[PDB]
Amino acid sequence: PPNTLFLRLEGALQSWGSNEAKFALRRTADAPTKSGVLGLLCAAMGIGRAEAADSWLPKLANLRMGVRIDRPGIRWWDFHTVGAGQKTRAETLLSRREYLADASFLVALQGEPELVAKLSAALAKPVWAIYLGRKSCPPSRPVCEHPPGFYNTLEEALSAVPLQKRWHNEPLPQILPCVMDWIPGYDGEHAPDDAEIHYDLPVSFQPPRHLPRFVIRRELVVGEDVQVSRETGTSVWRPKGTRADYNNSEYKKVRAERL
Amino acid sequence: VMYNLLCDNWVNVVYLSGKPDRISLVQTLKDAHCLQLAYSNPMDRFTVFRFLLALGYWCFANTNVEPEPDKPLPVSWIPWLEENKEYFELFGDGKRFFQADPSSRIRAITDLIHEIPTAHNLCHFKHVTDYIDGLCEACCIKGLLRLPVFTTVGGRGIGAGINNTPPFYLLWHANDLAGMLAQNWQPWDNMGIPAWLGSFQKESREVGLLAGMTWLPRKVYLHDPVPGQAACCSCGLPSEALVYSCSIEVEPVPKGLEWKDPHGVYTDQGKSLQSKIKLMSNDRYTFADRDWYSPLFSYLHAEGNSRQGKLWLVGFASDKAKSIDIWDKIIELEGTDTNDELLAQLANRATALNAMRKKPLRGDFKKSVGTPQIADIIPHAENRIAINAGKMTENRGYSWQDADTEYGELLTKVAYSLEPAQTVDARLKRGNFISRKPWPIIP
Amino acid sequence: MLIEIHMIQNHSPANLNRDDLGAPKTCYFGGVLRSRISSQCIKRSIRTSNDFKALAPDIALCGRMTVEAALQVAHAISTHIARPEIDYFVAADDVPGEDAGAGHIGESMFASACFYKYFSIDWEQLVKNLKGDTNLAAHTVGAFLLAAAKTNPSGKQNSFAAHNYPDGILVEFKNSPISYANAFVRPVSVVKESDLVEQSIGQLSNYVNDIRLGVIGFWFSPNNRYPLGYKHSKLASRNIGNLNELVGAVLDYIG
Amino acid sequence: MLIEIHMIQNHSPANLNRDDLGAPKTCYFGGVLRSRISSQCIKRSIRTSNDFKALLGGVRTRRLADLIQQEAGETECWKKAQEILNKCGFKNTKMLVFMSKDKIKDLARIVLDNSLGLTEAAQQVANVIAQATLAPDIALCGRMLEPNDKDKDKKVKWSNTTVEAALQVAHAISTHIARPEIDYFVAADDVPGEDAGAGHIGESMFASACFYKYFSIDWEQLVKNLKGDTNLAAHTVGAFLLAAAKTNPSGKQNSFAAHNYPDGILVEFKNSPISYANAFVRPVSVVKESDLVEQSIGQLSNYVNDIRLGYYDEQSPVIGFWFSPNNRYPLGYKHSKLASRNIGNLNELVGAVLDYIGGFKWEEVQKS
Numbered sequence A: 001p002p003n004t005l006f007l008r009l010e011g012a013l014q015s016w017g018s019n020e021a022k023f024a025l026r027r028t029a030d031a032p033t034k035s036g037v038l039g040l041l042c043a044a045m046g047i048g049r050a051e052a053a054d055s056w057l058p059k060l061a062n063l064r065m066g067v068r069i070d071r072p073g074i075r076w077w078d079f080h081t082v083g084a085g086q087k088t089r090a091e092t093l094l095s096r097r098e099y100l101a102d103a104s105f106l107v108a109l110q111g112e113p114e115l116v117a118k119l120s121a122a123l124a125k126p127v128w129a130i131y132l133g134r135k136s137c138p139p140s141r142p143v144c145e146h147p148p149g150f151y152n153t154l155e156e157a158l159s160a161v162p163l164q165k166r167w168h169n170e171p172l173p174q175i176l177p178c179v180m181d182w183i184p185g186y187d188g189e190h191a192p193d194d195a196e197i198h199y200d201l202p203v204s205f206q207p208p209r210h211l212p213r214f215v216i217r218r219e220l221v222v223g224e225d226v227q228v229s230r231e232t233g234t235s236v237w238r239p240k241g242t243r244a245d246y247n248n249s250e251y252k253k254v255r256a257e258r259l
Numbered sequence B: 001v002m003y004n005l006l007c008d009n010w011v012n013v014v015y016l017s018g019k020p021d022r023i024s025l026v027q028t029l030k031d032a033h034c035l036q037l038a039y040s041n042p043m044d045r046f047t048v049f050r051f052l053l054a055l056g057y058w059c060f061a062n063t064n065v066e067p068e069p070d071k072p073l074p075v076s077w078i079p080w081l082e083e084n085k086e087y088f089e090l091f092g093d094g095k096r097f098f099q100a101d102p103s104s105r106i107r108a109i110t111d112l113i114h115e116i117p118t119a120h121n122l123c124h125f126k127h128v129t130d131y132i133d134g135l136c137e138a139c140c141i142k143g144l145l146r147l148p149v150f151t152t153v154g155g156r157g158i159g160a161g162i163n164n165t166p167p168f169y170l171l172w173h174a175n176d177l178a179g180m181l182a183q184n185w186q187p188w189d190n191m192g193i194p195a196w197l198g199s200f201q202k203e204s205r206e207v208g209l210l211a212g213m214t215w216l217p218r219k220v221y222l223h224d225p226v227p228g229q230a231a232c233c234s235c236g237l238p239s240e241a242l243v244y245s246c247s248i249e250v251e252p253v254p255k256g257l258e259w260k261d262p263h264g265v266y267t268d269q270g271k272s273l274q275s276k277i278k279l280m281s282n283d284r285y286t287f288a289d290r291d292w293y294s295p296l297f298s299y300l301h302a303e304g305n306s307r308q309g310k311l312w313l314v315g316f317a318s319d320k321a322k323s324i325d326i327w328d329k330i331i332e333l334e335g336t337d338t339n340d341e342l343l344a345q346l347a348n349r350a351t352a353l354n355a356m357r358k359k360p361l362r363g364d365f366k367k368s369v370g371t372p373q374i375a376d377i378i379p380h381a382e383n384r385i386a387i388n389a390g391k392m393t394e395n396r397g398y399s400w401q402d403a404d405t406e407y408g409e410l411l412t413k414v415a416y417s418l419e420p421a422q423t424v425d426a427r428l429k430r431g432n433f434i435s436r437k438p439w440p441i442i443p
Numbered sequence C: 001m002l003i004e005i006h007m008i009q010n011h012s013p014a015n016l017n018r019d020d021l022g023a024p025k026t027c028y029f030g031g032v033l034r035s036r037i038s039s040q041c042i043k044r045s046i047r048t049s050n051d052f053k054a055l056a057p058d059i060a061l062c063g064r065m066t067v068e069a070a071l072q073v074a075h076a077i078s079t080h081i082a083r084p085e086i087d088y089f090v091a092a093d094d095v096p097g098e099d100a101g102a103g104h105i106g107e108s109m110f111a112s113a114c115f116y117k118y119f120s121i122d123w124e125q126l127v128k129n130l131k132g133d134t135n136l137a138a139h140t141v142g143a144f145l146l147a148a149a150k151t152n153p154s155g156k157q158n159s160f161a162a163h164n165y166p167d168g169i170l171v172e173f174k175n176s177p178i179s180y181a182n183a184f185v186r187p188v189s190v191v192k193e194s195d196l197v198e199q200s201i202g203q204l205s206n207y208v209n210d211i212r213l214g215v216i217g218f219w220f221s222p223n224n225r226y227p228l229g230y231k232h233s234k235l236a237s238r239n240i241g242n243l244n245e246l247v248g249a250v251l252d253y254i255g
Numbered sequence D: 001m002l003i004e005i006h007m008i009q010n011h012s013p014a015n016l017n018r019d020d021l022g023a024p025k026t027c028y029f030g031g032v033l034r035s036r037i038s039s040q041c042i043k044r045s046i047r048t049s050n051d052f053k054a055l056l057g058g059v060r061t062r063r064l065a066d067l068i069q070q071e072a073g074e075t076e077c078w079k080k081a082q083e084i085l086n087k088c089g090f091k092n093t094k095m096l097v098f099m100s101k102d103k104i105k106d107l108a109r110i111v112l113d114n115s116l117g118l119t120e121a122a123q124q125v126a127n128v129i130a131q132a133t134l135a136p137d138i139a140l141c142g143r144m145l146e147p148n149d150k151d152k153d154k155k156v157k158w159s160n161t162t163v164e165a166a167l168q169v170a171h172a173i174s175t176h177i178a179r180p181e182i183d184y185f186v187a188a189d190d191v192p193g194e195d196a197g198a199g200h201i202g203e204s205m206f207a208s209a210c211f212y213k214y215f216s217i218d219w220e221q222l223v224k225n226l227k228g229d230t231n232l233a234a235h236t237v238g239a240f241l242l243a244a245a246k247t248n249p250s251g252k253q254n255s256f257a258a259h260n261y262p263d264g265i266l267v268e269f270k271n272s273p274i275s276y277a278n279a280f281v282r283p284v285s286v287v288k289e290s291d292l293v294e295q296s297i298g299q300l301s302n303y304v305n306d307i308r309l310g311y312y313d314e315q316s317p318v319i320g321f322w323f324s325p326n327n328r329y330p331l332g333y334k335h336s337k338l339a340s341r342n343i344g345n346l347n348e349l350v351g352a353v354l355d356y357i358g359g360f361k362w363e364e365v366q367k368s
């Protein structure tokens, strides 16, 4: 019955690299690419490099999905010096890598119910260590945090899941972007003028071959279709309390007992 | 085996219905309104579009019929590109495509492509090894089209391409292949002698466009081994027997040849305008982001000017043989006049960005690093600015003052780190840190 | 099953990781600027070390030419707002001349931070690339604990001798890989009656007090200097005062 | 084999180190401001200490041609020394060059003053400069040099100039919260006037704090740097201990004569360096009973007991000597009986650490 699976992508840093990066400058995209979430699910199931290639990509790729951007993390560039040789020689490889800092994403993959159930079961039981696109970016929130459900369209699924405040008084985005695989509608229906190309459909994964896809963005407005959640915890530590009083009734009984 | 560009599939496109496919030259020729060029490498996409533009120029030179817009290309181009079947051939007994005089020097197939690392002055690369894995036929063709456009220096001894070191490449973009070809159609009276004919006669200078856009600085023969590969491991698509190596020599580009590439961007002194990208944040350079701002003064003044359309920029940053980074960008444009000094100021944003980076917290010395924490927040503000690059360029409601106030929150939260005191003087110095912004400069 | 190690380490004023311009590496978290130590910095500091050097061990822990190493580390996000500082140096000519000063006369950068450091090991794949050597895998996990307990990033340390030790290690054997970086969305404000490390460990304790409400945990502080949870509540399964018995308890839990 | 020195030193109101604006150096540690003394200042004060004249053997100068010309009563050779240095790689009167003093004197006199070729003379000078690494201050502080490859000729090759430092010095951070103070000074005019005004008005900045000092010496690297002459290594270690205990940085000492001696030195012998500054993450607040050195020593003893009862190896026992003048400040006042050899004499402490190092006495090693 539940035809949608949900993924929560939040960490201190994250990096879903774009198409224009396998040189020494290795940038990132503003939203999780389809190959990134597909690889996360592939690790959650835990199949090999070529076992993904052997008839596993299009079963997860025909699942037209959406990615919902809660807060926009900023682009931080890390200065990475690869040692190259430390057969070996004193040469240092130079690189700069882009990361998304302080961003939270929700990815809703819509497909047939049994695949969604298997995906949620493998998400609760990751047979391999899963991360946020780069191995040095482990998640800060559970990827299987939000339970699966049944929804007719991607918009209903991505608007049903609430937006969680980390703390009590933080600025929330009044406008909330959502990026989805382009629904073709009826047969034919050439893509609209806002449909951008994105080379993130995997068909082989060693070496990575990516196929283009059409990607369309809508905007959601919080407070009418996306609702906030409770705080559900405490932030500051505030060590325990001194300053015993001298008028409460529980004081005088112990005071008289000690006498 | 016998491979032809006309019948065998080598072009990566995506159909507007949404089905990506590898298709041949005829398929992308006579459809031309249902597909869009889809290459993972941006400059591969630009080189394939340049080849298609040159083919359209040849078809117009031999048929004299303009491609009218919103309606696919004239149907007289296919029989003119069809009857010379032996002509666009990689194999066979006769003329060959982008191949030339006999050869002796042999180099691996990894250097024809640029995105995959080559045999440097090292032994280890980005998990590649020469003479073991090779490219497919489509990859070989798209690497051969990289030669007239994106050939760099080979250590100051090996010459560059026909348009010097590979400059910024600017063109007009549309959602369709018909709009791809139509928006970049402007021809010249003299066409030239392109290199898909045989050994062209040099004669005099002023080649035109068709000879200059397809200049061949390198050669390819390749020695075919007995059988070949079983499973591909370099391209990614598992294919049949592939290539292993090739043979590359150089041709010295002569002196003179007063010639301008239609899509290139040329400086005030006539030299090529480069992409200012390098990871090396030097004394005089501050690394921010893709430098869409750089090739704007020359292109919007001399070649193309103000025109309603999309501006696709391809920038292959290089320094001698160091392939630094390739990026592309799409800018909307209407052509609402041109303010001269403001667009000139926008043409070099890296100077003001480096000047803002070099200003220290408290100090007067000029060889200092300034504030290195600013250098990690300039990239994000530059990326936020670069989305509205069309409104920045035409100056409708976006200007230098309206876009550099996007640095404000990053400046506040960096000043919190740099002045971590709850005092009066720390707050005042934080406020002085807030108003820091890239004052523009005249050149 | 996954072994997760959350380490809180307060470092004395130094510069352990340098960017291109010589600044300490800096990240962005909790809506404030944090001091960062890169993951590969801690990886190479743990590797190539005689503290750790004492089928092939340490190839499975950190990979080398589809190994997919069992151990990976997160970027060390500080628990508080980063405080980068300028140090001004001169180098004397130490030969009597008519002038004074000869060196670079430049400025270096340094910062002191309390880092949260996340480590994750998969046990099953660590056994898998060790060809079923369970005892060797247990020994190399104990060696990881011994090294990462007492190895620091060997950055600029000749002029900044920062050799501080962690004051808190939490080891759990939970189901899904979770980082407690969300505990420090609050930067740690320092009060008069408590120190920075105690407040950071308390923030961690108040965050693991949640999640369970909506697995186990071994807590290590040197001689119970910092107890995880200043109460009698069932928050830490075993308060451990010494590192050797912590490693022994973890190993006998695993096998 | 690592020798670790942890010292607790209370200082009078003084300005030992200052930044550009003449303020005492401050750093944030544990979320609070701490008075800081730079490690380079301590290293310079140790190298220019009175317990180092018989051991100082290195010069770090850019005026090398002056040194080479100074060993010539009448042989005027300064432009040719400058030219051979300019072709050696320095670009000018040069960049800073560190090597031994007797080496530069004797070898540069017998090399560059010789009437001979020009490029290979520069190669000989470069070899002399690079190979002159036999000085214990160079062995401790460390050095590497890189000449300018543009001004250097293509026929000059340089060998390895990288001297690995065997000494690690931490910045002396205060055990309590930093107390920056302002001194309003005037300068009276010695001749009278009709106005009675000072010649100059300014504000000096000073701070009094209890500093924690940290030193680490790598014995294997020290005997690798100074080669097999272990007698000079023991002399270097003893001279370092005496200089660190008995010398203060030469800041504004003429106006702030703060020459207080440290009340506590822990010399520990271990294979892993330990920073006890985490003892003072919580700032030391004064109380009615005891003093600041006693409170700081108590906090340090608490952390030492916690570290020994925490990070401990049965294969490598931790062992250290505690210092107090005539046993004035004991370490383990309540329970921490860890210091086995509380020592109330500096020469006895030096003898004990030299005996642990090996069969060395201080009088025997004071001859290299």
Ligand SMILES: [Mg+2]
Pocket (backbone or CB within 6 Å): B136, B139, B234, B235, B236, B237
């Ligand atoms: Mg390919």
